[PDB]
Amino acid sequence: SVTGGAKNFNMKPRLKSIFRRGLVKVAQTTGAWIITGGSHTGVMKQVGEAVRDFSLSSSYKEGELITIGVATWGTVHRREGLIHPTGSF
Amino acid sequence: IWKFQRHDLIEEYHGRPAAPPPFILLSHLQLFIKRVVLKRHKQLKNKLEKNEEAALLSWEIYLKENYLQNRQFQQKQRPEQKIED
C-alpha cells in the first residue's frame, strides 16, 4: 500500500528512478496487489504511469500487475454520469 | 561485403516490373501514359500513423534505458576499473 502527496508533490529525479524500477520490479515478480488512492494527481499518477508502460513493453506477456484504487465518492468531478440505476455494465 | 551487397539487387527487382523483356512494353506504355497524364512502395518507405508512431517511439525509448544499465554494468567489469576502484 503506497501513500504520498496528492496535489502538491515535487520530487528530485533520483526519487523518480526508484518508482520506475524498484517498485515495479518488486511488484511484478511476487504477483503483488498494489493498492493506493485513486487519483490522477501526484504520487498516484506516478504509480499509474509506471505500471502502464510495463504492460506495453511486456510484448504480449501473460498477467498484469493488478492495481486497486480507493478514493472518496464525494470529491469526484463528473460522477453524475456514473450513477446509473440499472446495472451499468 | 557480400551480405552488404545483397540488398541492391533485391531493391532493383522489387522496383523492376514483373513482365519479361519480350512483354515489358505493356508496362512501359502504361507507365509512360501515366506519367504523361499525371512513388515508392509502402514495403520500403511509408509515412506511418502518428499515434502509432508515438507508441512505437515510447516503446523504443523505454527499451533504451534497459540497454544502458546492463551496458554500464558490464563496462564496470573491465579490470582497469577495479584497479581504479
The succession of helices and strands of chain A, N to C, reads HEHE
Q: Tell me what portion of residues of chain A adopts beta-strand conformation.
A: 5-15%
The largest interface is: A-B, 3 and 5 residues
Computed over alpha carbons, the radius of gyration of chain A is 15 Å
What structural class results from the helix and strand content of chain A? mainly alpha
Largest sheet of chain A at a glance? Answer: 2 strands, parallel
Q: Helical residue percent of chain A?
A: 25-40%
Oligomerization category of the chains in this entry:
part of a larger assembly
Strand order of the largest sheet of chain A: 1-2
Overall, the morphology of chain A is globular
**Distance N terminus to C terminus of chain A?**
29 Å
Q: What is the number of E strands of chain A?
A: 2
Total of helices of chain A: 2
PDB class: transport protein
Keywords: TRPM2 channel, adpr, transport protein
Entry title: Human TRPM2 bound to ADPR
Chains A, B: Transient receptor potential cation channel subfamily M member 2
Give structural notes.
The structure is cut from a larger assembly and holds two copies of chain A. Chain A is globular and about 45 Å long. By secondary structure, chain A is mainly α. In chain A, α1 (13-30) crosses α2. Chain A starts with 12 loop residues before the first helix and ends in a 19-residue tail after the last strand. In chain A, strands 1-2 form a two-stranded parallel ribbon. The first copy, chain A, is built from two helices and two strands, in the order αβαβ. Chain A binds chain B through residues 53, 56-57, and chain B through 55, 58-59, 62-63.
